[PDB]
Amino acid sequence: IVGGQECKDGECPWQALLINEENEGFCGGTILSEFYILTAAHCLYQAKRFKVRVGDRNTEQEEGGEAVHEVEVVIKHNRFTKETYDFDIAVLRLKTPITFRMNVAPACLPERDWAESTLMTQKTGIVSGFGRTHEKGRQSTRLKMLEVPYVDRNSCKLSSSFIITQNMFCAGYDTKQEDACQGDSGGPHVTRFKDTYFVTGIVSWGEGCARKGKYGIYTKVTAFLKWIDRSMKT
Amino acid sequence: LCSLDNGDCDQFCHEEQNSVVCSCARGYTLADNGKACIPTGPYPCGKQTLE
Numbered sequence: 001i002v003g004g005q006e007c008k009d010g011e012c013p014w015q016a017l018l019i020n021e022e023n024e025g026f027c028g029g030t031i032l033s034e035f036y037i038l039t040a041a042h043c044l045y046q047a048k049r050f051k052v053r054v055g056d057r058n059t060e061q062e063e064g065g066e067a068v069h070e071v072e073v074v075i076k077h078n079r080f081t082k083e084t085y086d087f088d089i090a091v092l093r094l095k096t097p098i099t100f101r102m103n104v105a106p107a108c109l110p111e112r113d114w115a116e117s118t119l120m121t122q123k124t125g126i127v128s129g130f131g132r133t134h135e136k137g138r139q140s141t142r143l144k145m146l147e148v149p150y151v152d153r154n155s156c157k158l159s160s161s162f163i164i165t166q167n168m169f170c171a172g173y174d175t176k177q178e179d180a181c182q183g184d185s186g187g188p189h190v191t192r193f194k195d196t197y198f199v200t201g202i203v204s205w206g207e208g209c210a211r212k213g214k215y216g217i218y219t220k221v222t223a224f225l226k227w228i229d230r231s232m233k234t
Numbered sequence: 235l236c237s238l239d240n241g242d243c244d245q246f247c248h249e250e251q252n253s254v255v256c257s258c259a260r261g262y263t264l265a266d267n268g269k270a271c272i273p274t275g276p277y278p279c280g281k282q283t284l285e
């Protein structure tokens with residue numbers, strides 16, 4: 001995350017971290033339930049084998065709240081392709097149930113229409129992660145969060161050197177130096193409504209990070225609620 | 235009108251029979267006034283944790 005602030009205690013309980021066999025984080029994920037995690041499809045090809053970490057806020061150590069969970073099933077959206085990065089969504093079923101606690105809780109799944117007419121229409125959303133704090137930086141060691149403004153859809157297409165599909169949405173700043181980055185991919189984009197946070201997007205991609213005239217591209221969660229609901233039953 | 239401040243619902247809002255019907259996400263039960271959403275157990279989805 002570039003800019004933003006540090007995730008204080010209990011602030012981003014739904015944040016999940018995918019770690020490689022070397023125990024290094026490489027992508028984010030969002031807790032949906034005690035068994036399911038929501039992440040980005042392109043994060044899959046990114047690791048031979050991987051596990052999910054929860055309750056972590058600082059990777060340099062173990063404060064006792066962290067918990068590792070092995071993946072039992074990796075449900076990748078079949079239509080996902082790196083050539084367009086469309087359908088960048090994946091659901092993970094964990095082998096063991098997550099224990100909710102301080103810094104460990106799921107985000108709410110909203111209903112399509114309601115989310116689109118009420119959540120997506122909000123002024124801002126919230127993205128978080130342990131990703132790089134700069135375009136050319138290293139994996140951030142502290143969990144960060146950032147309030148990102150929802151961006152006009154047209155103003156979103158006019159700024160992208162790539163195709164923005166219906167399964168995508170822009171969030172961020174035109175010139176202000178704040179945005180998600182590499183490492184935050186797969187992470188949660190949540191929108192708050194009356195102090196309840198609903199998952200609205202999955203950190204997907206961007207041409208660099210915090211680049212003037214560019215935005216962060218997130219996978220619209222509302223476009224996959226059905227697919228997500230079907231993925232969580234099996 | 236679900237269009238007016240969300241029909242006073244805590245979470246989900248629908249417009250059936252030309253009225254307003256509130257509902258909640260999994261893990262919450264619809265309160266007596268049929269508007270508020272009450273958490274079923276500790277650590278309900280969508281809430282930052284305090285303990």
Ligand SMILES: CO[C@@H]1C[C@H](C(=O)Nc2ccc(-n3ccccc3=O)cc2F)N(C(=O)Nc2ccc(Cl)cc2)C1
Binds near residue numbers: 179181182185205
């Ligand atoms: C130059 O970029 C570095 C490299 C890395 C990267 O590889 N990005 C990347 C991925 C896919 C496409 N892409 C899109 C459509 C069709 C084909 C296609 O190849 C273009 C891209 F630039 N990156 C990044 O992920 N940043 C990032 C910023 C904001 C947020 Cl919210 C999340 C992530 C910044």
Ligand SMILES: [Ca+2]
Binds near residue numbers: 058062066
């Ligand atoms: Ca730690």
